[PDB]
Amino acid sequence: NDKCKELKKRYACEVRCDXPRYEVHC
Numbered sequence: 001n002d003k004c005k006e007l008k009k010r011y012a013c014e015v016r017c018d019x020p021r022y023e024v025h026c
Contacts, residue, residue, distance in 0.1 A: 007022055007024070
């Protein structure tokens with residue numbers, strides 16, 4: 001479940017990892 005971290009590194013814009021949802025506030 002580190003894809004959350006990967007996204008947070010990529011995007012810092014707030015990536016909301018809510019279960020299977022990744023809401024990117026950018």
